[PDB]
Amino acid sequence: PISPIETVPVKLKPGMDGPKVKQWPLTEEKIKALVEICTEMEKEGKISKIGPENPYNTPVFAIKKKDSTKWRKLVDFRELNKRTQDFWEVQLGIPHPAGLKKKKSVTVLDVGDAYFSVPLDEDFRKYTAFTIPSINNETPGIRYQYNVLPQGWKGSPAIFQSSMTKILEPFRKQNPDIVIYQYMDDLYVGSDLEIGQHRTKIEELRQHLLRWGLTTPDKKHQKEPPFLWMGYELHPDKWTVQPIVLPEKDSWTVNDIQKLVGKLNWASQIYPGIKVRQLCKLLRGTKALTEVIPLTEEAELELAENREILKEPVHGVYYDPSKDLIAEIQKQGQGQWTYQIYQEPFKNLKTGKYARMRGAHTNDVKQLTEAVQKITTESIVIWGKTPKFKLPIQKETWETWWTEYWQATWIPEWEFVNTPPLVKLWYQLEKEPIVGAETFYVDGAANRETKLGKAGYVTNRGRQKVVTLTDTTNQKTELQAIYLALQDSGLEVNIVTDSQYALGIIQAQPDQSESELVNQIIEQLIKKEKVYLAWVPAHKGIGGNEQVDKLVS
Amino acid sequence: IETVPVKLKPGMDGPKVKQWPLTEEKIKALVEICTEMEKEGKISKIGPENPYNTPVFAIKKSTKWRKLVDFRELNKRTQDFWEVQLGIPHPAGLKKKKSVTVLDVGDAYFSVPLDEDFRKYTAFTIPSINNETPGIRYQYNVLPQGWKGSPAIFQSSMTKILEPFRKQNPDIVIYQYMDDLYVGSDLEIGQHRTKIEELRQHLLRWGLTYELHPDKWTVQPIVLPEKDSWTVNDIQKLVGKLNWASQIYPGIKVRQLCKLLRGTKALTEVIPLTEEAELELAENREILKEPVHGVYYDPSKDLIAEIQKQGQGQWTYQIYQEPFKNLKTGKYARHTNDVKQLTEAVQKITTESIVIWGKTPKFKLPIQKETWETWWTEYWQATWIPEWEFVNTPPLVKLWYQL
Numbered sequence: 001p002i003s004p005i006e007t008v009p010v011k012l013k014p015g016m017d018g019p020k021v022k023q024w025p026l027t028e029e030k031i032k033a034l035v036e037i038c039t040e041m042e043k044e045g046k047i048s049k050i051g052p053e054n055p056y057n058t059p060v061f062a063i064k065k066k067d068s069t070k071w072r073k074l075v076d077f078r079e080l081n082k083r084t085q086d087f088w089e090v091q092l093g094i095p096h097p098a099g100l101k102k103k104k105s106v107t108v109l110d111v112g113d114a115y116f117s118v119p120l121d122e123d124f125r126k127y128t129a130f131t132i133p134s135i136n137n138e139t140p141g142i143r144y145q146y147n148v149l150p151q152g153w154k155g156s157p158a159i160f161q162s163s164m165t166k167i168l169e170p171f172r173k174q175n176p177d178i179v180i181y182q183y184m185d186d187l188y189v190g191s192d193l194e195i196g197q198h199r200t201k202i203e204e205l206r207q208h209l210l211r212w213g214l215t216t217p218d219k220k221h222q223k224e225p226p227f228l229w230m231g232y233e234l235h236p237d238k239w240t241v242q243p244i245v246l247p248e249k250d251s252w253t254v255n256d257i258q259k260l261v262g263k264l265n266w267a268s269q270i271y272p273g274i275k276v277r278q279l280c281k282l283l284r285g286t287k288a289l290t291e292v293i294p295l296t297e298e299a300e301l302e303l304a305e306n307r308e309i310l311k312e313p314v315h316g317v318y319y320d321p322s323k324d325l326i327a328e329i330q331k332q333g334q335g336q337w338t339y340q341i342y343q344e345p346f347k348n349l350k351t352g353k354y355a356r357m358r359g360a361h362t363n364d365v366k367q368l369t370e371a372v373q374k375i376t377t378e379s380i381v382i383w384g385k386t387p388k389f390k391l392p393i394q395k396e397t398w399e400t401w402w403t404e405y406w407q408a409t410w411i412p413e414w415e416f417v418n419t420p421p422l423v424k425l426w427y428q429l430e431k432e433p434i435v436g437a438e439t440f441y442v443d444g445a446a447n448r449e450t451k452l453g454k455a456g457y458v459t460n461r462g463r464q465k466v467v468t469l470t471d472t473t474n475q476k477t478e479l480q481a482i483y484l485a486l487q488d489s490g491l492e493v494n495i496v497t498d499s500q501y502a503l504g505i506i507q508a509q510p511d512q513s514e515s516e517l518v519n520q521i522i523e524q525l526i527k528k529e530k531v532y533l534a535w536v537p538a539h540k541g542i543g544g545n546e547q548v549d550k551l552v553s
Numbered sequence: 554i555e556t557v558p559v560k561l562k563p564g565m566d567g568p569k570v571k572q573w574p575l576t577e578e579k580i581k582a583l584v585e586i587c588t589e590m591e592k593e594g595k596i597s598k599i600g601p602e603n604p605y606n607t608p609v610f611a612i613k614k615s616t617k618w619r620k621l622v623d624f625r626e627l628n629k630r631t632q633d634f635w636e637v638q639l640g641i642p643h644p645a646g647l648k649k650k651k652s653v654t655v656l657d658v659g660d661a662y663f664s665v666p667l668d669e670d671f672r673k674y675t676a677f678t679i680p681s682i683n684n685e686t687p688g689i690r691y692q693y694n695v696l697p698q699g700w701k702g703s704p705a706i707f708q709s710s711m712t713k714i715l716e717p718f719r720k721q722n723p724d725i726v727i728y729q730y731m732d733d734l735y736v737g738s739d740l741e742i743g744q745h746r747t748k749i750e751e752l753r754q755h756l757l758r759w760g761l762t763y764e765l766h767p768d769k770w771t772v773q774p775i776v777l778p779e780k781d782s783w784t785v786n787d788i789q790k791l792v793g794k795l796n797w798a799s800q801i802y803p804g805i806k807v808r809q810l811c812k813l814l815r816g817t818k819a820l821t822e823v824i825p826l827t828e829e830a831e832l833e834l835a836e837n838r839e840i841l842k843e844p845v846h847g848v849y850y851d852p853s854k855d856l857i858a859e860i861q862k863q864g865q866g867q868w869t870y871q872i873y874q875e876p877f878k879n880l881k882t883g884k885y886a887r888h889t890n891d892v893k894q895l896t897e898a899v900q901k902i903t904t905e906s907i908v909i910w911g912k913t914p915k916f917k918l919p920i921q922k923e924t925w926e927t928w929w930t931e932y933w934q935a936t937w938i939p940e941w942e943f944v945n946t947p948p949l950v951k952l953w954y955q956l
């Protein structure tokens with residue numbers, strides 16, 4: 001049918017007029033095909049013969065489906081698209097399974113000829129005018145316009161979705177104890193009634209759609225669980241991803257490895273502890289898709305763990321609105337984090353995996369704070385509330401970080417759980433100068449053209465030293481001078497610099513870096529006992545600043 | 554009543570800002586509220602043919618969920634209108650007044666119809682959890698709170714409404730900024746409060762049902778330590794600080810003090826003071842106390858605000874248009890929630906900013922974008938929303954404004 005529902009007013013973009021593409025002349029079998037379709041369509045009410053005045057045209061085409069002997073009508077709305085208004089998003093975000101409440105009763109309902117069952121803005125049909133050429137293109141062709149929503153037009157998915165929503169509305173108000181999920185042109189219906197009173201309202205629902213143009217599958221034509229969907233496999237009281245098979249190959253091409261990383265990432269939302277770092281290092285470079293990549297030791301070790309975790313099947317449970325959500329996070333490796341959400345231990349609603357790094361230098365406390373946030377937003381999206389957290393970090397560790405760090409920060413309600421590795425601060429810089437500790441005044445520099453570089457220091461006990469660096473930047477040297485002061489000093493040292501740069505880096509208490517130097521500066525800072533870092537203005541003639549400043553050039 | 558025709562800025566299109574995820578409690582709240590004002594006909598459901606969108610969410614101002622709309626995008630896309638075509642002039646007298654009370658008059662806009670052909674630009678979406686259903690979409694039919702056009706379009710009515718009260722108290726300053734009325738007088742506080750109540754009654758006959766003290770506003774001057782003993786370390790700090798200050802204040806001198814730091818001394822060593830140095834030190838304090846010479850407000854230019862976390866629930870901030878030309882600086886103090894406090898400071902600073910310049914500043918916030926974006930809505934209880942970007946505080950900036 002063609003639903004009675006009001007139409008949605010459509011416009012074209014404001015400075016624009018509708019399409020006028022020329023019809024490409026079509027062979028004879030294609031002309032015959034299009035006639036056979038379009039007459040059957042105007043019988044159904046879907047289109048209508050017009051006669052020019054109508055100046056508009058979108059080209060037509062017929063294709064063979066595609067070993068069978070059936071044909072199909074393709075329209076190239078390419079241009080009417082371009083000239084049509086933007087619509088609202090048909091749907092932004094799709095439901096995550098782990099967000100679903102368990103249901104007593106489930107039925108899937110499937111709209112038929114959905115787009116063609118919905119009227120097109122009468123004022124707009126004129127722009128849909130298309131034209132079937134005559135044989136060897138000699139006479140005036142047959143010219144139709146759409147009455148319903150054309151397959152492949154810009155406005156159709158939005159307008160259909162909208163129409164299915166106004167039509168479901170009165171029934172939703174009346175049947176609030178029942179959930180309908182609209183995805184594309186399907187419907188999913190669940191309630192906590194018994195199969196009887198369920199199919200009672202199911203039919204009662206179909207007979208509501210039917211008053212409105214919408215024809216559906218009856219009792220005899222409804223699929224049963226699992227309802228594979230969108231990558232998931234959905235059962236009556238639990239869910240999992242669709243079955244994942246890791247290929248078995250001797251050679252791996254870049255394309256074999258990208259597909260694997262994906263299938264793993266997908267598994268990662270219900271299979272705890274999946275890793276992909278070692279496999280991802282592999283993709284770096286400028287290779288083609290056909291290039292075979294020899295797996296590293298650590299990648300194979302890693303494909304191994306993954307190969308095992310996936311061996312036995314795992315499932316996720318459904319959401320019980322009357323319990324708290326509990327999120328558990330573990331440091332799983334070098335900047336890699338894994339988490340689990342559950343309400344009753346340890347039956348997970350879902351699992352997940354955090355791997356980003358923020359900046360060139362972070363420490364675990366920072367990285368852990370970023371995961372909490374990431375996990376928090378996610379929870380808002382899937383369940384509408386934030387979880388109780390359980391983190392591998394003492395309250396005192398966190399409390400010492402928050403307080404002394406300059407950024408504002410905050411995680412919601414959490415608890416320490418002893419799941420090593422624990423996260424700790426790896427060194428504290430002193431808040432005051434050390435006494436009887438050798439004060440190094442360090443400095444570094446570089447010729448912007450030569451790219452030559454000197455880094456050195458002068459101390460108050462008369463020591464000096466200045467090494468040379470080849471092709472280094474004015475700021476690389478400044479870290480070097482500090483690495484320097486740290487190599488050549490005892491377990492306690494004051495260090496003075498003019499680099500706000502170096503300052504900033506070190507005062508952040510990094511514990512990993514995208515820098516070799518900074519990684520070494522770090523391991524030193526670890527080995528020390530007290531270290532006090534201090535900044536001074538360059539070129540003001542301050543302290544021993546001027547001295548070492550001369551040693552370098 | 555006849556609707557003022559509203560145009561966007563030339564060429565540019567309306568807001569397409571997507572809706573942030575909301576908590577079930579805020580969603581329910583919004584559903585009620587909106588079901589209500591649709592009955593009353595303030596908003597109507599809209600279809601997919603409206604491409605536009607701006608975020609909404611719920612706050613608590615009192616324990617009655619209010620509905621807030623982020624019209625920042627719309628505001629920028631309309632700002633020929635609320636600035637140059639109409640325009641509510643700022644009184645320089647407001648900051649001078651002994652007491653200023655801020656009144657919410659946004660309920661006033663809900664009476665005036667909105668230009669038919671502008672309404673599509675006010676579309677918002679109440680989202681759904683786990684994307685279970687499509688959001689519920691609405692546009693406005695009346696002037697919306699939060700939009701800079703509503704006070705601009707309602708100016709003629711506000712003047713009429715306020716006209717008698719102004720005539721009867723010609724020495725009282727009343728400013729309108731967005732959803733708020735600002736009322737300043739020099740009266741003793743009881744008389745002042747009494748005068749506000751008279752005002753409410755006038756307001757009350759048209760459907761319009763806290764106290765600043767702007768005088769008590771002064772610089773958070775750059776603070777130079779006074780010390781029993783100075784170590785080299787303490788001198789170097791002192792030089793750093795003055796070396797900063799000299800980019801802002803003219804006259805700043807350092808020389809007599811750097812003299813002290815010749816050679817390579819241990820940091821923890823005590824250097825006694827020069828008669829010159831101590832003379833310098835004082836005249837610097839003279840300068841630091843005073844407002845920057847040569848720094849002036851340019852109404853054609855954006856206000857910027859920067860905030861440093863000082864620890865101990867202390868927060869320093871400066872406002873300026875060209876970096877280091879500070880129009881003013883201050884501190885804000887005293888839950889040990891970092892984000893709660895920051896949110897409070899942003900509102901306070903924005904408030905002062907409106908009173909002095911009729912402008913909100915763009916804020917540079919010392920916090921991870923994502924952290925701030927998750928949480929700020931839990932503590933925001935103001936009716937406008939300023940612009941913000943996110944910034945790592947340079948370790949030196951923070952200390953130079955230390956207290």
Ligand SMILES: CCCn1c(C(=O)c2cc(C)cc(C#N)c2)c(C(C)C)c(=O)[nH]c1=O
Nearest residue numbers: 095100101102103106181188189190229235
């Ligand atoms: C049957 C258990 C899953 N389930 C569903 C549901 O069946 C469903 C859900 C989604 C998002 C997609 C698909 C598909 N394909 C099916 C529902 C429906 C009625 C929303 C439910 O409420 N609870 C539930 O456990």
